[PDB]
Design a protein around this nucleic acid. Structure first.
Lengths: 217, 143, 139, 120, 137, 60
RNA sequence: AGAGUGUAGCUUAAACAAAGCACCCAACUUACACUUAGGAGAUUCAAUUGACGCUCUGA
């Protein structure tokens, strides 16, 4: 009965920019702004604008516009951050600049004697250690840079077995606070990827169970 | 009547309330944001999904807001902003369930928010009442 | 003098402790005194039939959208929960102690802090102008 | 001249009637039942029914409730019922839907007041 | 003295060690529905029903009469679903509903009623007025 | 995701709250509903531990 | 590749039909909750018998 037990860590980076809004949600936001300006109350800006217009009207028979002009000028002068970088999406797939709107996860180049597989990192467990121990051990073995994945739960996230003799990997999940891409020249091609592109990448059906497990969102 | 089998048919007080691991004390959730409406809406979403999950919720309340003035001294310019803080108290969340709970919260988290999750402490509970100075003066006099 | 002072002190402190602590008023649930002026009032533009119909259609479409969103949320959370519980019961069947070890809590997982997304990513080299901040609050 | 069960003054549904109207507003449809004091039903109207719902847009709106009311008034005049009673809750009565229902039944020719028993 | 309960006492199925996890009557209406349901449910103890109720025999009432036609339920439901499909496909009904200005043909409703499920209502009225008990015993 | 952002102002007697940008020290941009129709606020920095570095940034 | 299964999320509900519950938006409510007013839903195909979908069992 030759058995083997492995622990693995699945870090999920949350996106830093909001989702691109659906047109439905866009026109409803416009409508909500409309209803809000309709049922809103007066402000100091409206007070000063209206009463200064009234003062000017009176003085004709006897500012807010400049401020908003200056503010619009400052806005036009200012430069905003870039959302999408198609160049990085093409030639810099192992980076963050390509996608900031959706969550990300990595994939490592793994090789086995029985079958070469493009799968998620894992490591071998030994008795005097916890599964989370093996998880952060894999993390420290693969990272080789200034990044830590903050854990969120001790419970198991995936169970996946395969025979040749028998191997059983248990997946935990974790959160990524920081992350870089130093030591760019690596044997294991670590690449942050989304769920659909991960599905395009890797075949297996234990991995398909991982697909149905992981949240799309 | 007592002797008869119908005794105890009406009693209800035992139905109504009378007045280690996998057992999590009352936890508090702070939500700080510049937009009172965003904070309130997010807290309402959290409360509704908690009620749907049948997870217990003690109470939800607002901490004292605070306004901060920021001034740029290249020449003197001024501006002001506000910060609102909501708080929720929960209990009884299972160990493994808390994982997906917090994960879904993080995922549905909208921009312009800062959320903390901690154990409820008397410090938090006493940071709501007015900082009465009288007790401090009497304590100093005692010292 | 000593005894009298000490007794007065202790008794006053006890009374203050047994006093019903008030709660700091929330400025959000208090309409500014300068909001009731009748000079602000705006003319209300009567709504058109077509515009109100559009509003109602948009509202009901968004209700459908949100119920679909919560449907898929239910689906995701149920799948995640059942998968986690399958893994857990397998680990329990295999190692009858590591499942309890996993069920054990851990204090470092309770205190979390996280920020929300941003309208744009941070600029690599951007410094703001020189200024300072100051908080203003009342009792 | 009949005797109506006076009593149950502590309990909300008063049995002091001869013909009661019970309305049921479900999450899908709307039912209305004219019944006798004994709990036996006399006549019914229901949005679950095809002859009525073929016309309609929603089985739960004010239009549906007032249509049910008009049809049930017609059926009361069919069965000879012209006096009857309705026990609403406070909010149930405050709801404009069955308010218009009551109004429609009154224009149909039914009063929601039972005559006081005669006996000298 | 005490005697064992004859039948299963009410409120016994619920559990008491777990009480806060339980779902409560959020509404007077929910409570009332459950109440009347348990009311028309039978009971072993003495109740209002067996004093002021008529005590009809447990055997059903005999009728060797006209059976209904054999209507294909599948095609019937299909045609009904197509009718309501075209209805929801109509354009003015939502405005009529949200403005509360619609009506319905009383004559058509009555005809379709007496065609589809009138006879059941008429049987109910007859057995209420007692025509059946007085005529056919 | 972010879905509960766009909402109705759940409050009676609410003044004009117009959308504006907010720039963090890190350059991150956020939406903020604010009183007057401005276009951006910016958060400055005040304090550092290095005296000579404070002096240098004051020079530059 | 073989076994089991199968009404919208739940219900051994099924004539007069697809019912009830659950659920969603808005309003009041700090919020929840209640209530009001509004919203979508299904028995995969051919005759209980077979064939389209689902889980399990093997490589």
């Amino acid at each position: 009965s030759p058995w083997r037990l492995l622990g693995a860590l699945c870090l999920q980076r949350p996106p830093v920019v909001s989702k691109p809004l659906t047109p439905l949600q866009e026109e409803m936001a416009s409508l909500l702004q409309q209803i809000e300006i309709e049922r809103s109350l007066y402000s100091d800006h409206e007070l000063r604008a209206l009463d200064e217009n009234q003062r000017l009207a009176k003085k004709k028979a006897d500012l807010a516009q400049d401020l908003e002009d200056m503010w619009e000028q400052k806005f036009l002068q200012f430069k905003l951050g870039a959302r999408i970088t198609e160049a990085d999406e093409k030639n810099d797939r192992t980076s963050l600049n390509r996608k900031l709107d959706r969550n990300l996860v990595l994939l490592v180049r793994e090789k086995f004697g029985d079958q070469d597989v493009w799968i998620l990192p894992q490591a071998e467990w030994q008795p005097g250690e916890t599964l989370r121990g093996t998880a952060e051990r894999t993390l420290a073995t693969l990272s080789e840079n200034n990044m830590e994945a903050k854990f969120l739960g001790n419970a198991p996230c995936g169970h996946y077995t395969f025979k040749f003799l028998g191997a059983k990997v248990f997946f935990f999940k974790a959160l990524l606070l920081t992350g870089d891409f130093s030591q760019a020249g690596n044997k294991g091609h670590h690449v942050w990827v989304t769920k659909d592109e991960l599905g395009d990448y890797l075949k297996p059906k234990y991995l398909a169970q991982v697909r149905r497990f992981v949240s799309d969102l | 009547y007592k002797t008869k089998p119908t005794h105890g048919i009406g009693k209800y007080k035992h139905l109504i309330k009378a007045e280690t691991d996998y057992e999590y004390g009352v936890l508090n959730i702070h939500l700080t944001a510049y937009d009172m409406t965003l904070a309130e809406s997010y807290a309402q979403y959290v409360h509704n999904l908690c009620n749907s999950l049948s997870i217990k919720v003690e109470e939800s309340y607002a901490m004292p807001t605070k306004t901060i003035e920021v001034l740029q001294l290249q020449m003197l310019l001024d501006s002001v902003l506000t910060t609102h803080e909501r708080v929720v108290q929960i209990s009884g969340l299972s160990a493994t369930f808390a994982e997906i709970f917090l994960e879904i919260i993080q995922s549905s988290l909208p921009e312009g928010v800062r959320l903390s999750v901690k154990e409820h402490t008397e410090e938090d509970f006493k940071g709501r009442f007015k900082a009465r100075p009288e007790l401090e003066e009497l304590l100093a006099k005692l010292k | 003098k000593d005894q009298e002072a000490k007794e007065r002190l202790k008794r006053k402190i006890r009374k203050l402790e047994k006093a019903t602590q008030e709660l700091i008023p929330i400025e959000d649930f208090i309409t500014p005194l300068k909001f009731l002026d009748k000079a602000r009032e705006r003319p209300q533009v009567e709504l058109t039939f077509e515009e109100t119909e559009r509003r109602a259609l948009l509202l009901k479409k968004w209700s459908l959208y949100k119920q679909q969103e919560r449907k898929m949320e239910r689906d995701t959370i149920r799948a995640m929960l059942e998968a986690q519980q399958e893994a857990l019961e397998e680990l329990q069947l295999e190692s009858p102690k590591l499942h309890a070890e996993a069920i054990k809590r851990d204090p470092n997982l309770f205190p979390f802090e996280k920020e929300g997304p941003h309208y744009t990513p941070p600029i690599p080299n951007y410094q703001p102008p020189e200024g300072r901040y100051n908080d203003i609050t009342k009792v | 001249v009949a005797r109506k069960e006076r009593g149950w003054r502590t309990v909300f549904p008063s049995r002091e009637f001869w013909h009661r109207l019970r309305v049921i507003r479900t999450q899908h449809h709307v039912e209305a039942l004219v019944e006798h004091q004994n709990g036996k039903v006399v006549v019914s109207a229901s949005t679950r029914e095809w002859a009525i719902k073929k016309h309609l847009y929603s089985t739960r709106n004010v239009v549906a409730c007032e249509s049910i009311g008009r049809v049930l008034a017609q059926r009361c005049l069919e069965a000879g019922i012209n006096f009857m009673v309705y026990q609403p809750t406070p909010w149930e009565a405050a709801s404009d839907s069955m308010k218009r229902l009551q109004s429609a039944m009154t224009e149909g020719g039914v009063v929601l007041r039972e005559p006081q028993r005669i006996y000298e | 003295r005490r005697t064992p309960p004859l039948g299963p006492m009410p409120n016994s199925d619920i559990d008491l060690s777990n009480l806060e996890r339980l779902e409560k009557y959020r509404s007077f209406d929910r409570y009332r529905r459950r109440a009347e349901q348990e009311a028309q449910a039978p009971h072993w103890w003495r109740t209002y029903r067996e004093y002021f109720g008529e005590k009809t025999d447990p055997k059903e009432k005999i009728d060797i009469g006209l059976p209904p036609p054999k209507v294909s339920r599948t095609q019937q439901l299909l045609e009904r679903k197509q009718a309501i499909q075209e209805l929801r496909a109509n354009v003015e009904e939502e405005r009529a509903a949200r403005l509360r200005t619609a009506s319905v043909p009383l004559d058509a409703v009555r005809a379709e009623w007496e065609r589809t499920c009138g006879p059941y209502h008429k049987q109910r009225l007859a057995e209420y007025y007692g025509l059946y008990r007085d005529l056919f015993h | 995701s972010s879905r509960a952002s766009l909402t109705r102002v759940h409050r009676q007697a609410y003044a004009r709250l117009y959308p504006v940008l907010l720039v963090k020290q890190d350059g991150s941009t956020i939406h903020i509903r604010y009183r007057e129709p401005r276009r951006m606020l910016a958060m400055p920095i005040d304090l550092d531990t290095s005296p000579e570095e404070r002096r240098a940034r004051l020079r530059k």
